[PDB]
Amino acid sequence: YFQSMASSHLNKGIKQVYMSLPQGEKVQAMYIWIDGTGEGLRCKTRTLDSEPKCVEELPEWNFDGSSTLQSEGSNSDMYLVPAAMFRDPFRKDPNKLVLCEVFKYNRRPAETNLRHTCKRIMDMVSNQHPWFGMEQEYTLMGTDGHPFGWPSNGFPGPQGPYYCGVGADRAYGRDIVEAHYRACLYAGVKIAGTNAEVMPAQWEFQIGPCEGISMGDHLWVARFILHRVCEDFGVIATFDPKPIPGNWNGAGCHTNFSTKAMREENGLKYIEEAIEKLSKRHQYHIRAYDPKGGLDNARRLTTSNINDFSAGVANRSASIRIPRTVGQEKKGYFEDRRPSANCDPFSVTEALIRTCLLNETG
Amino acid sequence: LYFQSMASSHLNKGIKQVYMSLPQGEKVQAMYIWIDGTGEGLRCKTRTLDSEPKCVEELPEWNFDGSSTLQSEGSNSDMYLVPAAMFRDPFRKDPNKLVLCEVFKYNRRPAETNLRHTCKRIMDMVSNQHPWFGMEQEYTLMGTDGHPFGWPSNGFPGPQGPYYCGVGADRAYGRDIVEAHYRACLYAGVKIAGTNAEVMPAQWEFQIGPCEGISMGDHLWVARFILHRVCEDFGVIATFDPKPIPGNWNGAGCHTNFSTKAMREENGLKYIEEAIEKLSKRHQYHIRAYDPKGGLDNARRLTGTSNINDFSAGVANRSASIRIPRTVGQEKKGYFEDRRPSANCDPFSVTEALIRTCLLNETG
Amino acid sequence: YFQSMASSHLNKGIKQVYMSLPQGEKVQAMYIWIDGTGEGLRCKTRTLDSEPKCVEELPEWNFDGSSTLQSEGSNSDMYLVPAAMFRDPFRKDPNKLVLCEVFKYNRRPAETNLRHTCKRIMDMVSNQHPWFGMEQEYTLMGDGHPFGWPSNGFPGPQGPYYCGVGADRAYGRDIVEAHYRACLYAGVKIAGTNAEVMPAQWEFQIGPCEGISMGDHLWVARFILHRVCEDFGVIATFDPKPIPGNWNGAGCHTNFSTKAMREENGLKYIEEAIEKLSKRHQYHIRAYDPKGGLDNARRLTGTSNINDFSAGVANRSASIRIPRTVGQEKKGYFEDRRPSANCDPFSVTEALIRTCLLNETG
Amino acid sequence: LYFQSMASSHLNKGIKQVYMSLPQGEKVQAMYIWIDGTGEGLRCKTRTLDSEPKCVEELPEWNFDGSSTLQSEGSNSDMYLVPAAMFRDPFRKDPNKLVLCEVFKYNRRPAETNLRHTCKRIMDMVSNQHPWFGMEQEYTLMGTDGHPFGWPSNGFPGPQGPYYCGVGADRAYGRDIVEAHYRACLYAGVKIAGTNAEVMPAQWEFQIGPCEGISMGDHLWVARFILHRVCEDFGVIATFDPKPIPGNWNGAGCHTNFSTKAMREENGLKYIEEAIEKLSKRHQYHIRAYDPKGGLDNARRLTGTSNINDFSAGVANRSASIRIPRTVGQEKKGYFEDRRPSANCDPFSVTEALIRTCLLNETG
Amino acid sequence: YFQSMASSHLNKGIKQVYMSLPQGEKVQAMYIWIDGTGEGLRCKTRTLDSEPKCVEELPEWNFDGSSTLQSEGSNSDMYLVPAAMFRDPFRKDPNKLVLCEVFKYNRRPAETNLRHTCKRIMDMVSNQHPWFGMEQEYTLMGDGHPFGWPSNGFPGPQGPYYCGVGADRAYGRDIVEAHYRACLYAGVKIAGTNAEVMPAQWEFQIGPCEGISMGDHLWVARFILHRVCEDFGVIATFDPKPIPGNWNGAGCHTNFSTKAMREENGLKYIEEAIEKLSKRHQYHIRAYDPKGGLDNARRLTGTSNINDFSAGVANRSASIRIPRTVGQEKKGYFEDRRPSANCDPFSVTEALIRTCLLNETG
């Protein structure tokens, strides 16, 4: 598969003229789901008679699973169940985005529905109020399948000046980042921040703190919003953990994590206990942390090493880093730096709970 | 060697504007800004706040990865950001903020390129004398091929003469950047005093001032950030190099105007002339404070518009190290102009040197 | 010197977003003056604490005369004294444009400050209320070939372009429309516009303006035109003969009346003024361009020929024309058709007063 | 105003070469060349002959339309062409010929721009003194937009210095024209003595000489024709304007070297110095003979590389009106150099003036 | 100074038609000399009545030294004395190329005439028959970025380009092939070629050349390279470090033997010569580029470091290398790896003789 240039050269002002027409009483709801790859998002739209006040008043829907690698033509309809509702930043109020769970012909969860089991697990431990903060790293890619703004058939200068950089020779693609940030605020996604990363054309947004199942919900809708923003601009966002081989930064999805007890005074005690637990389960977490069970991360994890578990205060080379502020106040949260940028947050967050809170072993 | 990238400037800017039009809701963006391991480069990142801060004191401390800015090691990387000065964000609009910070190491001591820490102390020592500064930031707009903006491909425009304070498609190159920057600075609350085209084509200038004490450095550094961010939108680069094009093409400085309460009062020329006398004994100390390479950058500029090895002063003399403007000479009160600072100086280093020499009576 | 392409290829939509930010309580004042060439306009901007209500509230300023061929680097400061204030059409209310007179280090007028003596002369005859109306002709230039002309060649022969309409007749009307509106917003007394005979050649009229204000309004109208052309990436030339041969030249025809010429039977005093003009032709030719005649020498071939004085009613071939309506009604004004398009209006208007009203000879 | 046309240079030149390869048979082409009503422009046309002429005397008279060259009226238009000098045609190859002609009016008197007629008579008057001339034709290669060939679009290259006798993609602009012209002139039988790059980028030079008497003008004019025809194939223009680019860019001349039998014999410097003395009394007459506008063209060049109003001479002095080359000074025999002639002079006018002043002892 | 595009877009087929015309009996001689920079080559052409059979039949000539920074306009003539003649590869038989020595108005050598003293030194040791072999490294440049490199960026890291083959490794071989053939036709003693480590970087070797002929052949080989590059519209740079950082620098390594070093057990005299070299390192660094060391200072970081002298067998990190074969066979030559690519060979070869054979000190 290749990028297609034609759409980005369409006249965008014409579109804005149409989008300015007042739409009347009817409401658009764009249903969003995960396909048979476990990585690709799909969407379509229905008109509703009036504005829903919450996710619960959205009707069930369905799609053709024989066109998403999930079912067979002769018995095709698959189920969509509203999970999380947001305001649509592409169409504006009263219009909605709806992230859904997918079920089979028999009402059984689809194989790539990882939210179903994750929600049960989060319910088991809600008394401990688990909070997550995920740092989505990504690379903008241009037309030729080469990173956005890089020289054709070539490389820019060595890494160094791009991290948190400003100027036409440092920051590539800030228009995407700015529009995504604002789109997430309007939607009601819990976007905590942004920065430029170390590889040129590589960028980052943070989603959090989100309690339990809302983590995966917010991150998946944030990813959807990014791809749709990028589409408008004609560029591609990749969550590949090592888009360019060699001495060019990979992309992760660092997962920050705390429990009520970790956040309370001297909760550093419970942080260290959780890290201890994680230290005995490194390979299980590696298999949960990218969609190919570790094969994607093997291209990135030279930052920490893929075979080795480590932990330390302010150590950006360790598997797990305790932020310096957390080490100082003796409470807060810790950072798992192992998740690949293309991980599924429902898989990552469930594994943390199972290892750290439900004391599963193996 | 780093080149610019053309791609970002060819993105559809009307698309960005439609997204920037969405009402953002109750949350507020704060972009923290700081100086990196080179002492010249600016860095930034953004967090979301619960509500609008009413003053810099309400903003939280933060941190960053110093191993990615040439400031710390990867295994012990977190470095501190402590808010110093807050402005309105002209790129995102109210309720959003820009936050210039100081940088501190893992052990809470100031980073090597944190020159505001000692400068603020010095300004506190002399606050009763109310030191005011005005700085004239000269710069050159550069294109995409490392060649000045608007210049012929692989060549030169006509000789210097018509471009200074010039008007027209064949005189003024890049006024769009200038106009946008002036308005971005007024919206932000940066104390922008004025603008002009300079003598080299594609070279411009803005003045920041009069700023009391430590606010000079603050306002200057935020003004430079704004300029980099404006040029970024347009796909051009601003260089503060003191001699971007060798030969008979104008260099770039950061002329620093200065007065105390006593120099501003009637007959304060007496105190202006005393301060200039102290400066004449410390030429070389000021040259080492007046660019990031200790004089090496200015050596390409200060040829004879003063020579780098000779100290001079005179009324209305744009060839001297120090100029007394004619109006100050006539009125027998005001300020004087140090024309020595390189365009790429750090205002914290320049302001502090002037105070140490002229007011704290240091020698050597 | 050549035009630079690049600024016209900057994204003008970006600038407009920045200019839409509310500026607050500070005010920009752009000071404008004439340089050592006597034809070049220079400008720069200062921030003010509040909005001035008339010109006399604005402060004196100064500039580097060593960068404008007016003084030496070692003693470089030159004075700017505000003379006339307008509203700024480029930055809007409350921002101002301010035409200044230039003075030397010793407070004496600069060589190219012709306003100083002109104002004194206008004051000596205030009771006769001289009004002036000036017709500024100019050509829009691209590469410096006229704007819209074939690359390395020529459009069809003159005939259809005068007051013309259509893609094949009117070259550059965008400029003309923007300029007209900018002048109305500024408070410049713009009286009308038209397309002239040479393709890419256009005209605006400033007037009727009393005494010293003619020079002020016309100089500010010229600055407005250069700045408007700048935005569009084109150049305006007031050269009297930009293209040699059988292509129209460019004048600044100067219409002139006193209170007496305007009252009933004022034609008597018009004819009396033209009679005084007939004896002083070479004096006026030397006043009527910055090279003392050598510029007009390229235009005044036949149009009147440079060394020959003539007057007639409705005669567009004469040095002086009395318009048909003025002849019919026996009152009004007459037209001096001799001034080059690059004349200084201070110089032209002073010469008319000295000859026609102060009865000077030699 | 006339511009060049780009279309002809984009035609497929390999196609032309295939046709030019056909053996042409027994018939011969003769291209007649003459000077038009401006005194500067060359014109040509071609006839077919029955066989190859062995000398210019075997070529027939011809004629043309003088109403189309600014020389005669449409109702009585035929004008005469009388062969003066024959060369081999380097554009069509042997057996084909180039024929420089004199122009004569309907009444068989010489055209107003026929300056060879009187010049030939003068040369006959002094043939016993064997006047030899060598002329240094300077010229500038111009592009397609009236701007010098290779120069940046709407701009200037780096300052003069490296381009004189220069080598490299960033020094030598247009050497293809030069190399082709040199070979075209040798094939033709034009007495080409040498070439060099000049001080302005895109400016070159060739020498024609030593030519006795009237052959100087002949060989020079045919060399210029060859140069125009070569540049035409390549799509560039050669200008003989004495100052194509105003300011600190080199002008173009046609330095005229000159000797008689007596100046060439041992101790002939004595006769060189006598001739230079006669020239010093007639500076203004020679300036009026030395460009087609009587001095007006050279006024843009001769600024001070001699001033137009002052006569000077010196050994090895490239700032003087007349230079005695060092080798001539040393050897006490040879020639001297008149550096005054404009690149656009007519060699018939220059050579004749030198003879009239130096040998026929005319005054005024 | 910038390259000019236009000449490379001229129709080169047109030129070849003209160069195919039989020239007749006259002969072109192109005289070549070194200018006031000590690095720039200058040339011009005279017609001769017949073909010279050796250099001594060619006449003296002269040039304008005021246009080459060697003399003043009012006394401008400088002498050219033919030194070495070659066949002209650009114009063919019977046409010649002629390297000259330059002299002042008073017959004394020009400041940048280093051949004069070098020849005298070579004559003092003719019986020892010094041979030299020089390895000229250079980079092909476009806009001045290296030729074939990405616009505003960088090719992949060094490794595959050395002695490389393929569109993705060898940049500019057309030049190298044409140059090699032109040198063989000329009679220049070209010994070989290769692609070097930096992409667009190449090398030719001239030698073994006895005494003064080394400087002559290498200077003529450099002129041939500049003229060949000119045809192709590219530029050759002998700068020692054209691209900063981790991109190969450029030397002119100088191999050196006397008759004694070449006979059996000559290694003894090699080692003896290197010993004399070890005491005079700074002398040679000052001889070994035109800025007396300041150019080599950009290259001699580590390659040897500028202030440190070292020698070893097969050591490409040393100042002096004794090749492996020379060590094995106990006879031959040694390599001085210190000379910058922009050295004057007259200067280098003279220094070797003075130090190693005339036993000079200080």
Ligand SMILES: Nc1ncnc2c1ncn2[C@@H]1O[C@H](COP(=O)(O)OP(=O)(O)O)[C@@H](O)[C@H]1O
């Ligand atoms: N108590 C907490 N529990 C879980 N996550 C948290 C907590 N406090 C903050 N976070 C989240 O941690 C994340 C930190 O991301 P970031 O600022 O990129 O840190 P760094 O770059 O230092 O790793 C943010 O998403 C934030 O919302």
Ligand SMILES: Nc1ncnc2c1ncn2[C@@H]1O[C@H](COP(=O)(O)OP(=O)(O)O)[C@@H](O)[C@H]1O
């Ligand atoms: N009393 C003062 N002390 C310090 N600075 C001052 C004082 N008065 C004015 N200034 C500042 O001096 C600067 C003058 O800059 P500019 O107008 O570029 O002057 P010039 O170009 O004539 O050197 C402005 O920033 C202004 O705010």
Ligand SMILES: Nc1ncnc2c1ncn2[C@@H]1O[C@H](COP(=O)(O)OP(=O)(O)O)[C@@H](O)[C@H]1O
């Ligand atoms: N009484 C008057 N005194 C001076 N100028 C006048 C008077 N009445 C009109 N004018 C001016 O004369 C000018 C006429 O210009 P225009 O319409 O171009 O005339 P035309 O093209 O017929 O010569 C206008 O500027 C107008 O304001």
Ligand SMILES: Nc1ncnc2c1ncn2[C@@H]1O[C@H](COP(=O)(O)OP(=O)(O)O)[C@@H](O)[C@H]1O
């Ligand atoms: N005895 C002579 N009489 C006339 N001309 C001569 C004589 N000897 C040489 N010449 C000519 O003088 C010209 C010298 O031109 P050139 O080499 O450009 O000299 P420079 O550039 O030093 O002025 C050549 O045309 C040459 O043929």
Ligand SMILES: Nc1ncnc2c1ncn2[C@@H]1O[C@H](COP(=O)(O)OP(=O)(O)O)[C@@H](O)[C@H]1O
């Ligand atoms: N006896 C010798 N004396 C001087 N130079 C020699 C001798 N033998 C060979 N050479 C020269 O030494 C040079 C070796 O260059 P090259 O093949 O590039 O070597 P390397 O790449 O191994 O250093 C060639 O110019 C060759 O002619």
Ligand SMILES: [Cl-]
């Ligand atoms: Cl849809």
Ligand SMILES: [Cl-]
């Ligand atoms: Cl950010």
Ligand SMILES: [Cl-]
């Ligand atoms: Cl301004």
Ligand SMILES: [Cl-]
């Ligand atoms: Cl023909």
Ligand SMILES: [Cl-]
């Ligand atoms: Cl040549």
Ligand SMILES: [Mn+2]
């Ligand atoms: Mn982060």
Ligand SMILES: [Mn+2]
């Ligand atoms: Mn990150």
Ligand SMILES: [Mn+2]
């Ligand atoms: Mn990182």
Ligand SMILES: [Mn+2]
């Ligand atoms: Mn992190």
Ligand SMILES: [Mn+2]
């Ligand atoms: Mn200033």
Ligand SMILES: [Mn+2]
């Ligand atoms: Mn300035």
